[PDB]
């Protein structure tokens, strides 16, 4: 069991990469949600207020 040790090390590493990128993506996209739908609501309420005026 000489190669399995490094194989499992590379495992640990790649699971770490896929996880870390998954959570950073999740936060990225929830923050992007907040950003995008809030800016959209602001712009649409603005262009509705001007239209009603």
């Amino acid at each position: 069991a000489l190669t399995p040790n490094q194989v499992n090390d590379e495992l640990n590493k790649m699971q770490a990469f896929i996880r870390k990128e998954a959570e950073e993506k999740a936060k990225e996209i929830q923050l992007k949600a907040d950003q995008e739908y809030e800016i959209e609501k602001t712009n649409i309420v603005r262009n509705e207020t001007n239209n009603i005026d």
């Binding site: 990225e28 923050l31 992007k32 907040d34 950003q35 809030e38 800016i39 602001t42």
Partner: protein, 181 residues
């Protein structure tokens, strides 16, 4: 136990009592050295957001432990603002650049505050079109236009703050000052 200012012969500035009151709430090692600097203003630096960002150069080499204070007066003299530890400047959409120690406040002759909570880290954001504080469901906790004319404030999970502006949902700007410490 005292603070100083550096304005230049303009109509409206900030009061020393207000700065003494606000000095209560911020990270230690910052309240100790007390010489506030007027980094930008609305009266004697125009009314352009780009001018604001250019004036506030993220020059943190001399002191990366520097507090940034934004004070804004709403339409009907309702003063409020927030405290930030990082200079404002447009960034890539990757992440909010902000330490989990900022806070908001509603000042008056009646101080209040809303320290950062660990629920999340939202809308500590900075871009060429707007500059808003904590947010979440519903619009941002604080917001200033590209043109510095209207603003929005609402409760958020990042701070659990109340509504700061006298005109809650949206309002207009009449004077803005920025301070560095």
């Amino acid at each position: 136990r005292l603070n100083g200012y550096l304005p230049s012969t303009k109509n409206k500035l900030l009061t020393p009592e207000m700065c003494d009151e606000i000095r209560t709430l911020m990270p230690t090692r910052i309240q100790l050295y007390t010489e506030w600097n007027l980094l930008y203003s609305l009266e004697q630096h125009g009314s352009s957001l780009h001018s604001l960002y250019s004036n506030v150069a993220p020059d943190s080499k001399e002191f990366r432990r520097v507090g940034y204070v934004l004070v804004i007066k709403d339409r009907k003299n309702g003063i409020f603002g927030a405290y930030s530890n990082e200079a404002f400047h447009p960034n890539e959409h990757r992440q909010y650049t902000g330490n989990g120690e900022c806070f908001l406040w509603k000042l008056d002759k009646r101080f209040s505050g809303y320290p950062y909570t660990g629920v999340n880290e939202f809308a500590i954001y900075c871009t060429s079109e707007f500059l808003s504080m904590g947010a979440g469901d519903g619009h941002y906790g604080l917001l200033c236009d590209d043109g510095l004319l209207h603003g929005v404030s609402n409760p958020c999970q990042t701070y659990g703050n109340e509504v700061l502006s006298k005109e809650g949902k949206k309002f207009s700007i009449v004077a803005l000052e920025v301070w560095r410490v």
